[PDB]
């Protein structure tokens, strides 16, 4: 059972800008998604200090980068707090409306797309390189869900039937045809060293066989 929702008008406007604007510094998407993973890991770690049972769904706190040349997908896995069903459909987009609005006013004032993280909407920079984004997430208080959007003004949410995650978020980027450089090992290493050298959790690059 799949439910289809419409993006909030400001978010759909931002996504259309991100895909259609000519902007060559696309590598900032990985910094934004790693920063998102670091924030999610900070939250579950903070919550576990007063309730250690929140780590029953997994003690390890890490970020995994998994490129797949065959599927042309770059996957970013974290064992953070995860996202509930209300997070995917309503609450996180509601928090993002103001940041989205301010980001586009800035872009009209000559600001750069690379400053998307300062407005707390850095996730949508994934569409700089991805034609479709699939998000598998599991929160301690909810079931495992699958969020997906190829932009165009709509996204889908469904209960995920695949492999159980325990807890965390998996961001699967279905890369555009001309953005396969982010499946290269040495390219991912350069981006992580340049943008994410100060993340307080282990970032592991999965080398393909
Ligand atoms: C980067 C912050 C921004 C705030 O809205 N996005 C987050 S934290 N999550 C989003 C909600 C849906 C599930 C993943 C995306 C789409």
UniProtKB/Swiss-Prot annotation:
Maturation and modification: ISGylated. S-nitrosylated; negatively regulates the ATPase activity and the activation of eNOS by HSP90AA1.
Keyword Nucleotide-binding: yes
Protein name in the entry: Heat shock protein HSP 90-alpha
Assembly: Homodimer. Identified in NR3C1/GCR steroid receptor-chaperone complexes formed at least by NR3C1, HSP90AA1 and a variety of proteins containing TPR repeats such as FKBP4, FKBP5, PPID, PPP5C or STIP1. Forms a complex containing HSP90AA1, TSC1 and TSC2; TSC1 is required to recruit TCS2 to the complex. The closed form interacts (via the middle domain and TPR repeat-binding motif) with co-chaperone TSC1 (via C-terminus). Interacts with TOM34. Interacts with TERT; the interaction, together with PTGES3, is required for correct assembly and stabilization of the TERT holoenzyme complex.
Residues of the full protein shown: 16 to 224 of 732
Keywords: Acetylation, ATP-binding, Cell membrane, Chaperone, Cytoplasm, Host-virus interaction, Hydrolase, Membrane, Mitochondrion, Nucleotide-binding, Nucleus, Phosphoprotein, S-nitrosylation, Stress response, Ubl conjugation
UniProt comment concerning the protein's domains: The TPR repeat-binding motif mediates interaction with TPR repeat-containing proteins like the co-chaperone STUB1.
Lineage: Eukaryota, Metazoa, Chordata, Craniata, Vertebrata
Protein residues bound to ATP: 36, 78, 97, 123
Domain of life: Eukaryota
Family: Belongs to the heat shock protein 90 family.
N6-acetyllysine modified-residue sites: 43, 69
GO molecular function: ATP binding; ATP hydrolysis activity; ATP-dependent protein folding chaperone; CTP binding; dATP binding; disordered domain specific binding; DNA polymerase binding; enzyme-substrate adaptor activity
Subcellular location, record wording: Nucleus; Cytoplasm; Melanosome; Cell membrane
Keyword match DNA damage: no
One GO CC annotation: sperm mitochondrial sheath
GO biological process: activation of innate immune response; cardiac muscle cell apoptotic process; cellular response to heat; cellular response to virus; chaperone-mediated autophagy; chaperone-mediated protein complex assembly; mitochondrial transport; neurofibrillary tangle assembly
Functional description taken from the UniProt entry: Molecular chaperone that promotes the maturation, structural maintenance and proper regulation of specific target proteins involved for instance in cell cycle control and signal transduction. Undergoes a functional cycle that is linked to its ATPase activity which is essential for its chaperone activity. This cycle probably induces conformational changes in the client proteins, thereby causing their activation. Interacts dynamically with various co-chaperones that modulate its substrate recognition, ATPase cycle and chaperone function.
Organism (species): Homo sapiens
Mutation effect (residue 82 to D): Abolishes ATPase activity
Location of the region described as Interaction with NR3C1 in the Swiss-Prot/TrEMBL record: 1-209
């Amino acid at each position: 059972e799949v439910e289809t929702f419409a993006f909030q008008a400001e978010i759909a406007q931002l996504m259309s800008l991100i895909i259609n604007t000519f902007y060559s510094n696309k590598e900032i998407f990985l910094r934004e998604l790693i920063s998102n993973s670091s924030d999610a890991l900070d939250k579950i770690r903070y919550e576990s200090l007063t309730d250690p049972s929140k780590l029953d769904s997994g003690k390890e706190l890490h970020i995994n980068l998994i490129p797949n040349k065959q599927d042309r997908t770059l996957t970013i896995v974290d064992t953070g707090i995860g996202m509930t069903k209300a997070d995917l459909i309503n609450n996180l987009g509601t928090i993002a409306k103001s940041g989205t609005k301010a980001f586009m006013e800035a872009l009209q004032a000559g600001a750069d797309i690379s400053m998307i993280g300062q407005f707390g909407v850095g996730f949508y920079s994934a569409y700089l390189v991805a034609e479709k984004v699939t998000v598998i997430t599991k929160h301690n208080d909810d079931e495992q869900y699958a969020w997906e959007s190829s932009a165009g003004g709509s996204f889908t949410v469904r209960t995920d039937t695949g492999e159980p995650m325990g807890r965390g978020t998996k961001v699967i980027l279905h890369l555009k045809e001309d953005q396969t450089e982010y499946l290269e090992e040495r390219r991912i290493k350069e981006i992580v060293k340049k943008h994410s050298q100060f993340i307080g959790y282990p970032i592991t690059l999965f080398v393909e066989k």
